[PDB]
Amino acid sequence: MAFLMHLLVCVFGMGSWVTINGLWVELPLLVMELPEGWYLPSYLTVVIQLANIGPLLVTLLHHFRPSCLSEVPIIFTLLGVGTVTCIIFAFLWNMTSWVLDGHHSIAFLVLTFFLALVDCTSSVTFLPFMSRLPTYYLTTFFVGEGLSGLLPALVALAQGSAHFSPLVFFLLLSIMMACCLVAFFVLQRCCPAHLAFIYTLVAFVNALTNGMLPSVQTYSCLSYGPVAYHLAATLSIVANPLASLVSMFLPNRSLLFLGVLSVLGTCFGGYNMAMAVMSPCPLLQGHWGGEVLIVASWVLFSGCLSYVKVMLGVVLRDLSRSALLWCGAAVQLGSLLGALLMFPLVNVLRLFSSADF
Template sequence: MGFSLTLSLVDCTSSVTFLPFLDRYEPIYINAYFLGEALSSLFPALLGIAQGVGQTSCIKNETGQLVEYNSPPRFSVKAYFLALSVIMLASLLSFITLCLTRMGRKKDTKSNDSSNLKDARPVVELSTVEKTNIDLDIIENIDAMETECQMTRDEFWFSEHGIYLFLCFWTSILIIGATPSIQSFSLYPYSIEVYHHTIIACQFAYPLMSFLGVLVPSLRSRHIYILTVIGTGLFAYTFMAAKLSPCSPLVDQFTGRLLISFSWVLKYCVLYFIRVLLGNYFRRKSGHRGLFWFGVLTQIGSLIGAVVIYLLTDHLHLFRERKICVSYSC
């Protein structure tokens, strides 16, 4: 239990501490972080598939009743955790390599914190920027932070920066906090095959969106808002399917199976792509401070989403899981 608690603390605090650390590196490294974060969930899922976990079938017992039968794993739990340990060791070696070398670091590592800004700002002519090697991104960050400092609290939260912070918090509630807890309630009614195939497909969504973030590092605000509405709507549909379990919408029809699978995969793609876009935005606009708050709000949103779903499941008993070997009249 102690090891589990320690591992959980490391997992939860890594995004808060490591994201600001990446501000000293080139922009491509933030996309590499998102890709690595995605692979950290994809690899264990693939290992679980190779192990054969979750393969359930219905067999008749001595009395002739259908009961669930879980197939034995192809290799032991010890081998599974050893494989995960290799992944963690590779992560540790990669981090040590980053710390000991200057590979990929920005040429100018000065802090962009507004507390270090002086009242009198130097005037730089555009014709001399190239000669003096002044990074235009740093100038843009200074302008943005000075504007933030002049805002009141209400003005800040209704500004683009404040809205994006809220979107980071909101998407964390949906995709990290709430979504994993309703998977079985939402997908099991449509068959065990739909459940497994959909979950596997969802694990590929984050890596693909990380690659897409390299090609499309930013979008206009209106497009991000539209994507947020779409992602929220998809979450609402999957949540409704979980709430209505075991008689979810179109549960015994091919259209229903196709619709629920498509909704889950598209939800993962949309919400994770928003997170990649927001990470690129905060790195570009606020640097170290923006990435820090991006990580903090990610953890707060994840906690709130998980707690809410826990209360709905274990205390209010809002969801009912469909038994695969039981016939329902829906």
């Protein structure tokens, strides 16, 4: 039974980022009933990226006293905390407290901090678990990783703003996390600059697609109405798996081609930001072609950058494994820098404008 190992490894690597993805795909309904509104992603990004205090601490504790380190209790802790945090988030998302002379969503923020801590720690505690398993089972891990975002997107596309309250969606999230919990129980029972270029490009691309452009998605997309934001978020989440699949069938390791596709994706990202900086009325506002243009632009941006990410990953993996470690390091540093750079632009100076429907 080598292939049952592959199915388990897929469904186990799937849950590595499924809670944050479910949250961000349900977000087109969580806004508009909370006090924050269009500012919420701007915090939700900096919070998720400050939650990188997790992997730093796990590495510190691995370096200080590796003897006490035990991996399976760590991962069971992570998965159980994920499940309970989802069951709680089902009930405590819309609760609002009166603090600091104003309404604020403290429960939402701290529970997002906990979910982001769990998923950020999974990133660094899930790879050295596959080092002891067979090497022939290492790839279907990546299939599960890629498809981490497909099923919440499909539940949302059946939901469709509603059809059923976010409570049932979050309970489904809890059930999926419970299934990942069950599955994990069985696994243990010339010039030097040529490399620096790839690290810098991964940092840049992840800063663009994790911290910067997600931080202003409301101003960019929601101006065309609710359905524009609905489809844009859901299909931008579906478009990363299929980008990975097309990468797996038709791969290219040449640096120039991946760089040029990066430039094309960055031009699409500039078009994504240019409409945000022009709310409440961007070009072709309240027009048929406008919504399809913005949805297609988000889909193409996300796809052409996810493909580049996966192919840089294949290059790095065929070089060595310290490559993958530093890949994770650069991904996290770039995401952090992007969120920190876009925070004082959006929030203090208030360059971006809101709208009424």
